[PDB]
Amino acid sequence: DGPAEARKVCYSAVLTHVKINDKCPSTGEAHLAEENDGDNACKRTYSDRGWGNGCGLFGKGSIVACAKFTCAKSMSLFEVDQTKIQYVIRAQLHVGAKQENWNTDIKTLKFDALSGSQEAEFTGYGKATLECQVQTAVDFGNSYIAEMEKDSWIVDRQWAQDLTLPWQSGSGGIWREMHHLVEFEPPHAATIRVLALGN
């Protein structure tokens, strides 16, 4: 019931059109106001400039490119407390019941990690005692619950933590390591192209 949220891993990102500022060699560093924003992916590089592309000195010229990052679809990673795991066990006695009455004659027993002996008392036949315990040693160690829009799994904590994808922490927080979905091709003269790595 309500595992604590740990991560959000973006697997589908939508990019705006890239914006570029550039300078000639020995003219300064290029600057964009987009460069100071948290939800923007930028690269800051240098470009071979000269008389052939609008500069008076041949050499490296500063160039900056920025594209706004918004995550379309992200996989949610939940962290699991084993002490909060619950289970339901259905019990039933063989007497004579028709199949259609089985759902009526079944006692459903709910257990916590800290529940004691629980009773399934059947009217007329006494009662039987159940003392149970989950086995979560060899499948429930350092693990997350990873769920997409329609699917869910149990994954290694370290496997999901080592994913080469942008990730986030909870609220409207910054998308960390956006380069895993946004790359910038080498600049030509005064233009930089963005390589979107895909869904």
Partner: antibody
Framework: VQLVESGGGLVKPGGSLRLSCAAS????????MMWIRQAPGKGLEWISY????????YYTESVKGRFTISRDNGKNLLYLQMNSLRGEDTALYYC??????????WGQGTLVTVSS | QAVLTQPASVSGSPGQSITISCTGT?????????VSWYQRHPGKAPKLILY???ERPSGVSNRFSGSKSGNTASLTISGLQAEDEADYFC???????????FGGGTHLTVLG
Amino acid sequence: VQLVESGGGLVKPGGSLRLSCAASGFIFSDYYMMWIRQAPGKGLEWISYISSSGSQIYYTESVKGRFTISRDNGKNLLYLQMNSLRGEDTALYYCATETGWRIDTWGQGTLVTVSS
Amino acid sequence: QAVLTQPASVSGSPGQSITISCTGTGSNIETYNLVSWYQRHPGKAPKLILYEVSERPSGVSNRFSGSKSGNTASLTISGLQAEDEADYFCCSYADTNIFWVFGGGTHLTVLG
């Protein structure tokens, strides 16, 4: 921080015009600029869009072959050369800055009327 | 394509609350979620009053608020004032091909 437009006026279809937008109060060479127009009884619409250096140019198909946007970062000026004007080009034209992928600051606008 | 629809005119009395809506097609408000609202008094330059759906520029009063629901952006003005009488423009970054598209405009009338 203000933008000022000038150059609008009356003209015939097929005529020519050249809008000028002067910027002050900020580093003009750091910001994308664009031209925005509103025709009578119609919605707002961007037609030209230039980068900080002037290296990246964007036009709409309505004005792609007829209008030319440019800028002079030395004199803090933004130009819109309008050629082969049409009656549909009659509108009130704005020059506006662009940052954060939004249209940030506007000018008061300059009226362009194309009449036969 | 990209068409942003919003009513021609909405009216309110001084001190009440008013809401202007901006409805579009398909994508165009829902994909990128950066929608800006503008205010234009007759003859003056349009003023950015809201951007990124709910963000407020420096010095824009707390009465102006913005919301989004799917393909609808909303500008809510509470505590109407006489100076609020202006045209209100809705803008949204549609895609990498259309870039920006505008609404038809809404004239608010404060019943002075």
